[PDB]
C-alpha cells in the first residue's frame, strides 16, 4: 500500500498487542486461583488452555522457549521435526523437564503436579 | 409542536383530549388546505 494502511488494519494493529494486567472476572473459564493441570486429559491440552488464557501465540511461546533454553536442549529442538510447541499441544511429543519448566515460566501455571522438596525425616 | 396541545389522543380517548389541537388542525387542512 501507500504510506498509510487501512484504518481497519491500524485498529487491528493496535488491538493485536493488548496486554491486560488483570484477570478481572471470575465468570471466565480461564486459568485463575486454584488451577489444576489434572483437570485436562493431558499436558498438551493443559498447555493449550493456559496459552489461550494468557493470549499468546504459538510462535512467540516457541521463540521464548528456544531463546531461553540451554544449548543441548536447543540442539534437540532444532533436530526435532516440526514445531515442538505445536506437537506438545497436539499430544504428539513428550517434553523434557527443562522444556516444561520454560513453558511453565511462559504461561504462569504448572503443567504437572509440582513437587516441593521438604526436609522431613522419620526417627 | 409542544405537548399540551400537540399531543395526540390514544386508544380510550375516542379521538379527543381536553386541550388538543392536532385533530381539528388536521381536519381543517384536509378540508380546505392551509
Amino acid at each position: 500500500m501507500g504510506v498509510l494502511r487501512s484504518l481497519y488494519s491500524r485498529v487491528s494493529q493496535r488491538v493485536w498487542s493488548t496486554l491486560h494486567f488483570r484477570v478481572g472476572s471470575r465468570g471466565q473459564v480461564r486459568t485463575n486461583k486454584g488451577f489444576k493441570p489434572t483437570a485436562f486429559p493431558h499436558l498438551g491440552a493443559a498447555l493449550f488452555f493456559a496459552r489461550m488464557s494468557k493470549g499468546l501465540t504459538r510462535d512467540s511461546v516457541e521463540k521464548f522457549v528456544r531463546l531461553n533454553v540451554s544449548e543441548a536442549q536447543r540442539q534437540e529442538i532444532k533436530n526435532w521435526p516440526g514445531s515442538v510447541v505445536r506437537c506438545i499441544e497436539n499430544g504428539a511429543c513428550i517434553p523434557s523437564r527443562e522444556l516444561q519448566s520454560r513453558l511453565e515460566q511462559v504461561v504462569g501455571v504448572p503443567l504437572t503436579r509440582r513437587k516441593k522438596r521438604a526436609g522431613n525425616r522419620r526417627l | 409542536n409542544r405537548n399540551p396541545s400537540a399531543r395526540y389522543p390514544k386508544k380510550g380517548n375516542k379521538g379527543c383530549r381536553p386541550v388538543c389541537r392536532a385533530m381539528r388542525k388536521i381536519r381543517k387542512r384536509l378540508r380546505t388546505g392551509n
Binding site: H20, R22, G24, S25, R26, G27, Q28, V29, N32, K33, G34, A39, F49, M52, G55 | -
Partner: protein, 125 residues
C-alpha cells in the same frame, strides 16, 4: 430497609470465546443475601430446623459416607457449635473412620481448627 445489591459489568474478555467445558472460578453473586422482610412462621422454622435435623441425621447415619453427606448438606447452616463437631467426630469413630483427606471431612477439620480455642474439652476432640 433498602437491600443494596448490584451486578456489575466487570473486566472480562469473551471475544472469540472458546468453550472448554470447564467450570468458571466462582459464582457471580457472593454478597450476603440479607432479607429485608421478616420471615413467617414456616420460613423461620425451615431456617432453624437444621439444629434438630443435623444431629438427628448424624445419629441415624450408619456410615461415614452418610455422615459426611449430611455434614456437607448442612455446610452452609450457621452457626455450628462444639457439640455439633464432637457429635460428628464421635459418630465417625463409631461408624469406623473415614479418609481424613476427603474434602467433606476437611470441612469438619477446618471448622474444628477455627473454633479450637472455644472448646472446653479440647482433649476429647
Amino acid at each position: 430497609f433498602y437491600y443494596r445489591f448490584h451486578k456489575r459489568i466487570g473486566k472480562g474478555n469473551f471475544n472469540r470465546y472458546l468453550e472448554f467445558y470447564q467450570k468458571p472460578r466462582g459464582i457471580e453473586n457472593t454478597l450476603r443475601l440479607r432479607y429485608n422482610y421478616t420471615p413467617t412462621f414456616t420460613a423461620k422454622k425451615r431456617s432453624e430446623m437444621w439444629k434438630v435435623n443435623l444431629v438427628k441425621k448424624i445419629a441415624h447415619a450408619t456410615d461415614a459416607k452418610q455422615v459426611l453427606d449430611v455434614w456437607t448438606y448442612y455446610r452452609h447452616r450457621r452457626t455450628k457449635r462444639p457439640y455439633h463437631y464432637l457429635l460428628a467426630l464421635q459418630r465417625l469413630v463409631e461408624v469406623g473412620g473415614c479418609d481424613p483427606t476427603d474434602f467433606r471431612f476437611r470441612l469438619i477439620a477446618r471448622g474444628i481448627y477455627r473454633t479450637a480455642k472455644r472448646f472446653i474439652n479440647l482433649p476429647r476432640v
